[PDB]
UniProtKB/TrEMBL annotation, chain E:
This is Uncoating factor OPG117. It comes from the Viruses. Homomultimer; hexamer. Interacts with OPG148. The chain holds residues 577 to 628 of 785 of the full protein. Multifunctional protein required for genome uncoating and replication. Major viral uncoating protein that is required for the release of the viral genome from incoming viral cores containing the viral DNA genome. Possesses an ATPase activity that is required for hexamerization and uncoating. Coiled coil: none annotated. Belongs to the orthopoxvirus OPG117 family.
């Protein structure tokens, strides 16, 4: 809504609703930056509060909090406290935004932690301030919802600043004090600004200046603890007996000073003795222990009265969005700049141990006992209810140390890569130095590629399709066609398989022929179960069926593999569905033959040609005489070893990325080539030469009758003997009699005359006069 | 005392955990009965219902040991079992239940009463269940193209609507329907329309149970089709093959019972519930191993006429025998339907047809007139009549027509009966059927005489 | 309880047989849709199966 | 036989039947809802006493 | 069997992939007879003869 730049101000607290509606200038005002500054300057002792003029259109506000701690802290304690407070509050708000407002935890963290205005009250007995997050915007109903979780965080933390969060001022018509202005006419203390923020729009929670680095999102109690245990905790922290004992009741808790015999130095500040004795106060369900008189002689102490420490630790670990539950009931953790999941060995305890550095020291020491880490893991599993979607951005290449942007070539490492929840990684680290164009390895790889597929004019299209198929493996989406690497021996299909394996790493799996032969549903099929979020799978050495004795590759499997999802379950699992981002590549020396052929199969089969031979010098002319190759090149033997050494990995990766960039016109697809595999040629020629019967061709019987055709009940039918006599001049029986009878029975209708009749006419006959 | 026992009693009072007749538990978290046995959800539920508890009780549920103790108490207190989803007129969506009687959808505790485990797998939105939409108008045009509203295609349209709408009812269906067409006549179009519509309650498969023997087998499909409201059987392999297996009438009858007998893969369960509307889409004419009166009662046929042709193939496809209308293709139609745009509009259309055809029952009625061999089998009965007492007094007067008398019963010799019937059907096509009828209704008394207790209707009619 | 036709057609001992195993202490057993012998090559009911 | 009123005459001439009645469309649902459970149980017990002296 | 990776897992162990560092030798009294003969298979078979 482009925000607002007018500041609405009330003067006196408790102004009437009638006065607010009438907008009487005696109390109601509206200014801009310069007008506000001039008003504050000219009128020094005027009260100034900020509110919302409209809750129906300008509900957009910033993220703000109020903290007031009734104690004095020195500089170092103040700095560590504010650091911990910022981290905890930003994590809590980001987790709430992610889990309720549908926002993104990482941009929320970035916007809240980039900059903030932090004032300081001129009063010296206490530490109070307002904090404004400039670049985070949301509606007021969002704060309405945030109230509960912010109160829970306030109640469940030891930090004085976080514990002293004012959970009010999150209501309707909420009014915030204006900086530099007294709250009461009879008081003098005010709030003053702190560097590097010096202007006045930096401290107003309604002023909106949305820019690039911005983000917006939208949608003694008897139950605390036994009093004896509370006093026991106080004494146990004191580490010394108390002179005034058995006289402090529940009623005189906040009145009677406490006196300590200084046998051991006061553990709060290690000082040998204190002039004035120590006293207790009850704030927000915690006992604050302080010393009267000197504000810096003793460090203030916090004793909680409720909650569970190992539950607070688990909540703090959970609200960093580093453990998540997927739609398949598996827990993914963010360790070492990657998303990892392992059903065999859960990694939650590893995450708990590793994440202790991003937690306050009080919670840090508890995460060293394996028993307590197991307790925290048990808490986390119970809190993780509901699931989240993963791997939804098909433009990113996930490396073990980050994410490479395919549309740009920019590498994101660390938290920047955390947004893209890519749960499968190549397994190795990206390297920008080795991801360069000019390199001797690059020239060697270009030589190899041009050797395997020449750039000749005849080969041009096949080489381009080679590039297309190799590039589309990088796509994280689902493609609608398979690729067959058909070629003769010693031609480089296994070499390019090894090249892709080295280039893609763990985003690559090799499976057997069971996928192409057996039923995919069946029972336990870990081969199908291994294609989860893969991008390149390989089936090698398809057992071709030139001789009878083996079940042919079934069409059902190849139709099912094209689907965006695949139905299949592993051993001892309940999930039945896995996403199909993988490109299915099968290596064979022979033409595959499918059991059932129909129309749809001409939209799924793309094959790649290999016509280059690498041979020993002895078989030079022996290979040259063969027509299986169009060129013979000498064979290099250490090339396999150096490829196994992953020497060409980054060169081939750069080449693939450039191919993807070139081929990636907005959205990309794959197209079959149903003219190379020979078993489809039968049906192609039959379709281009034979068509079914017709009813709209009824006023065209003259030429058919002149040729010799007969008419019956408006359906063209002819005997089988003359069908064979007519077809004997196009197809030979000794060639494909099995296929001939196959389609004959497929289209048999029987009836008519005294023999079977079929609904078929010849395209050549109707084409001829 | 025993705060933990009190907590367990309080939780069990809300009926959030149930024990089903499979020796397993179902829990209600996130407004859905998510049965899970591999990993229990009871501790998750215990931690979830924590703020609906007194403050002196909420603090004890933060310890995993105490949560496990409460779960053990609940497991010991359950004891009894309940029945799973029994309401047929309730469609369960991932976030509630939709009553088809008033088309009203409700979630929360109001949807807890209908203990439905199976679900569509996708959420339901209130603001897209509307009559007016670009999706609505485009879908209406598509259906009006596929099934024209002309008075010739009236009963076919009614059958299409009824069978399509029956996929929502959670009862058992007594008929198997056929989608008959020639080539690309919207078959897979309406199949993928249903897949987009319901989802996770529709199973697409080819042959298997339709072709093989159901019993004496480890076949998984029979267990797969448990509590699924729609099942499609496609790509039937042209049983007019002379070498390929036929269709079993016993298989058809097994598929048309409230309970289906099957042995999934490795377990010992042998019975499963049948709710699916089994739809079989074929181009070639199906042929059964053995047809009879009982089989003819369980088959319905829906014919597909209007076809779509590309601009280039328009002249090629504009002349077809079984075509009735020619229209144009659409390259982005399949991707667009996979974009789930027509989902809720087609749900509303299915609900409307369901309300139309429940008055107040939607029993599926067989249509045997479409199948020509069924027509031959029934015309044999219409052109004949079994011998009865009314034919006894005739005797000699009817025997003058070319018949004889056997035990005061009008009888015809087998050879003369064959000569008489040979002038109606085609011998080449119906020789096996004639042999089948002869061996199915034969009567013998001695070495020579062979009796048939049937008389032609035209012989009786003619003076 | 309801069971398939294998009870009358196939070998009772063989390997596993939950169809037979489920008849423990059941007061009534039903089998439906007898496989008409009108199809050549069909199986036959076993007299020893009846006796067992 | 229990038939619809259209094919009633077509199936009457069959010798496999001695009687023909009108098919009832509510029997399946009424049985599925366990309406006749205790009535059939009472008849079964009466027949048991009759035929097991 | 000549590829650098093989698939198979032990009992009570979720480890599937195995490396292929092996020289595969088969000692026989008879020459092997293969179902399919092609130019590719000829690149993977060698025979040593024992004649004492
Ligand atoms: N550009 C190249 N320059 C030199 N040697 C090469 C080149 N490309 C491949 N080779 C080598 O030539 C041989 C070809 O073997 P291979 O890669 O297995 O082909 P192939 O078609 O997969 N053999 P096969 O699986 O039996 O059909 C290997 O030793 C490669 O290292
Ligand atoms: N109303 C329409 N307008 C334009 N194109 C349409 C329309 N309806 C269908 N089509 C197209 O025509 C095709 C018809 O094919 P369809 O009948 O659904 O599959 P099919 O070929 O019969 N499957 P199968 O029977 O196994 O061969 C659809 O896939 C669409 O591409
Ligand atoms: Mg190879
Ligand atoms: Zn001290």
């Amino acid at each position: 809504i482009r925000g607002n730049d007018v500041i609405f101000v009330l003067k006196t607290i408790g102004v009437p609703s009638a006065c607010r509606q009438n907008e009487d200038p005696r109390f109601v005002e509206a200014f801009k930056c310069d007008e506000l500054e001039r008003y504050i300057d000219n009128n020094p002792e005027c009260t100034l509060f900020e509110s919302l003029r409209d809750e129906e259109a300008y509900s957009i506000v910033r993220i703000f909090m109020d903290v007031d701690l009734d104690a004095c802290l020195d500089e170092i304690d103040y700095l560590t406290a504010i650091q911990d407070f910022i981290i905890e509050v930003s994590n809590c708000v980001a987790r709430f935004a992610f889990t309720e407002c549908g926002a993104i935890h990482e941009n929320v963290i970035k916007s809240m932690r980039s900059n903030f205005s932090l004032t300081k009250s001129t009063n010296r007995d206490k530490t109070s301030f307002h904090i404004i997050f400039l670049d985070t915007y949301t509606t007021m109903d969002t704060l309405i919802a945030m109230k509960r979780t912010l109160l829970e965080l306030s109640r469940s933390s030891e930090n004085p600043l976080t514990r002293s969060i004012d959970t009010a001022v999150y209501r309707r018509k909420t009014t915030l004090r204006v900086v530099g202005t007294r709250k009461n006419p009879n008081c003098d203390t005010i709030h003053v600004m702190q560097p590097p923020h010096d202007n006045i729009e930096d401290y107003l929670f309604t002023y909106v200046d949305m820019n690039n680095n911005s983000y917006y999102f939208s949608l003694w109690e008897p139950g605390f603890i036994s009093f004896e245990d509370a006093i026991k905790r106080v004494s146990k922290i004191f580490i010394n007996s108390i002179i005034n004992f058995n006289d402090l009741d529940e009623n005189n808790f906040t009145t009677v000073p406490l006196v300590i015999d200084y046998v051991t130095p006061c553990a709060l500040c290690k000082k040998r003795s204190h002039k004035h004795p120590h006293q207790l106060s009850l704030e927000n369900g915690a006992i604050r222990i302080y010393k009267t008189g000197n504000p810096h002689s003793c460090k203030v102490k916090i004793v909680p009265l409720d909650g569970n420490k190992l539950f607070n630790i688990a909540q703090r670990i959970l609200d960093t969005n580093s453990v998540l539950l997927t739609e398949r009931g598996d827990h993914i953790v963010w360790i070492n700049n990657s998303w990892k999941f392992n059903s065999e060995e859960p990694l939650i305890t590893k995450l708990i141990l590793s994440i202790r550095h991003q937690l306050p020291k009080e919670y840090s020491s508890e995460l060293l006992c394996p028993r307590k880490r197991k307790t925290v893991e048990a808490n986390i599993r119970d809190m993780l209810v509901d699931s989240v979607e993963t791997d939804t951005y098909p433009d990113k290449l996930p490396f073990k140390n980050g994410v490479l942007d395919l549309v740009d070539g920019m590498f994101y490492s660390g938290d920047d890569a955390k947004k893209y929840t890519c749960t499968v990684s190549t397994g190795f680290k990206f390297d920008d130095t080795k991801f360069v164009e000019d390199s001797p390895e690059m020239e060697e790889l270009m030589n190899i590629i041009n050797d395997i597929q020449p750039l000749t004019d005849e080969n041009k299209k096949n080489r381009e399709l080679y590039e297309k198929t190799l590039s589309s493996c990088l796509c994280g989406a689902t493609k609608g066609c398979l690729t067959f690497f058909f070629g003769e021996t010693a031609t480089g299909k296994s070499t390019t398989k090894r090249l892709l394996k080295s280039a893609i790493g763990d985003l690559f799996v090799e499976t057997g022929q069971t996928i192409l032969t057996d039923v995919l549903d069946k029972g336990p099929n870990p081969f199908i179960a291994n294609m989860h979020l893969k991008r390149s799978v390989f089936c090698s050495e398809l057992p071709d069926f030139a001789c009878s004795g083996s079940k042919k590759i079934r069409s059902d499997n190849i139709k099912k593999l094209t689907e965006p999802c695949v139905i299949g379950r592993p051993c001892f699992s309940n999930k039945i569905n896995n996403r199909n981002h993988a490109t299915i590549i099968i290596d064979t020396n022979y033409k595959p033959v499918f059991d059932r052929i129909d129309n749809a199969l001409m939209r799924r089969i793309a094959v790649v040609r290999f016509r280059t031979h690498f041979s020993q010098p002895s078989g030079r002319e022996a290979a040259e005489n063969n027509d299986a190759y169009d060129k013979v090149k000498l064979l290099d033997e250490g090339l396999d070893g150096k490829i196994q050494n992953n020497r060409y990995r980054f060169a081939f990766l750069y080449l693939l990325v450039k191919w993807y960039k070139k081929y990636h016109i907005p959205i990309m697809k794959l197209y079959p080539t149903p003219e190379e595999i020979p078993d489809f040629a039968f049906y192609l020629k039959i379709g281009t030469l034979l068509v079914s019967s017709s009813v709209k061709h009824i006023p065209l019987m003259t030429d058919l009758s002149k040729k010799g055709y007969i008419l019956y009940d408006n359906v063209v039918t002819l005997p089988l003997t003359t069908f064979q006599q007519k077809i004997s001049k196009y197809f030979n029986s000794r060639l494909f009699g099995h296929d001939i009878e196959s389609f004959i029975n497929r289209h048999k209708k029987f009836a008519n005359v005294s023999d079977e009749y079929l609904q078929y006419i010849f395209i050549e006959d109707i084409s001829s006069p």
